[PDB]
Amino acid sequence: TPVEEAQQKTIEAITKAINYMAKRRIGALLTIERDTGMGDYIETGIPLNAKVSSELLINIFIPNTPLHDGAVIMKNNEIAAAACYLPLSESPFISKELGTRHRAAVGISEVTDSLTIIVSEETGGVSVAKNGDLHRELTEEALKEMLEAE
């Protein structure tokens, strides 16, 4: 269906952008709003309300650019805003080598049902935060399965 074709197109755009950033070790933080509304966090960022493309996602996160610092938040199959604030987790059970990008992803996942993807600037490793837990060192197939399950 149209709705299903649109969701798969968005998943493919996300996975292509994540793969590009993982290969180049570009740090990234991408939160997908689900049933819990995230308007309060969207409003801290730069409004985009933009169509999803792998190209725009990549351009947003290039280091030392206006939009790279903070989270992209997606809502209703669009990029709602970039450079958004997310709350930092105080969980003592996050790997100690990880920094604020991963703590921000876990933090938003503690108070929403959202799914957040993180690319590490140190290793290019891909992880996902959901329900207060961080799932680390994901393959491409694993990330796709998580997006399709979500």
| Cα–Cα distance for residue pair 64/52, rounded to 1 Å | 22
| Cα–Cα distance for residue pair 94/145, rounded to 1 Å | 23
For residue 142, give both structure tokens: 């694993």
**Residue 53 exposed, middle or buried by CB count within 10 Å (0-12, 13-18, 19+):** middle
Query: For a second copy, which residue of 7, 19, 44, 54 counts as binding (CB under 8 A)?
Result: 54
Smallest separation (angstroms) from ligand UI4 to the CB of 60? 12
Residue the block writes with tokens 């740090």 = 27
Query: For ligand UI4, which residue of 16, 24, 136, 144 counts as binding (CB under 6 A)?
Result: 24
**Residue 69 exposed, middle or buried by CB count within 10 Å (0-12, 13-18, 19+):** middle
Stretch in the footprint of a second copy (CB under 8 A) among 36-44, 49-57, 93-101, 142-150:
49-57
- Does 46 help bind ligand UI4 (rule: CB under 6 A)? no
Question: 101 or 130: whose CB is closer to ligand UI4?
Answer: 101
Query: For ligand UI4, which residue of 64, 76, 95, 139 counts as binding (CB under 6 A)?
Result: 64
Choose the contact partner of 24 out of ligand UI4, Mg ion, a second copy, none; CB within 5 to 8 A by kind. Answer: ligand UI4
- Does 49 help bind ligand UI4 (rule: CB under 6 A)? no
| Cα–Cα distance for residue pair 18/140, rounded to 1 Å | 9
Which residue ranges make up the site for a second copy (CB under 8 A)? 46-51, 53-56, 58-60, 62, 65-68, 79, 82-83
